Amino acid sequence: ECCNPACGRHYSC
């Protein structure tokens, strides 16, 4: 999973 503001596209946390 992703977990950043950058992950806005593929976030999941």
Swiss-Prot record:
| Compartment list | Secreted
The record's tissue-specificity note reads: Expressed by the venom duct.
* Disulfide links within the chain: 2-7, 3-13
Location, primary (coarse class): secreted
Q: Which GO terms describe its cellular component?
A: extracellular region; host cell postsynaptic membrane
Keywords associated with the record: Acetylcholine receptor inhibiting toxin, Amidation, Disulfide bond, Ion channel impairing toxin, Neurotoxin, Postsynaptic neurotoxin, Secreted, Toxin
Which comment does the entry carry about domains? The cysteine framework is I (CC-C-C). Alpha3/5 pattern.
| Family per similarity comment | Belongs to the conotoxin A superfamily.
Q: What is this protein called?
A: Alpha-conotoxin GIA
Q: Which organism is it from?
A: Conus geographus
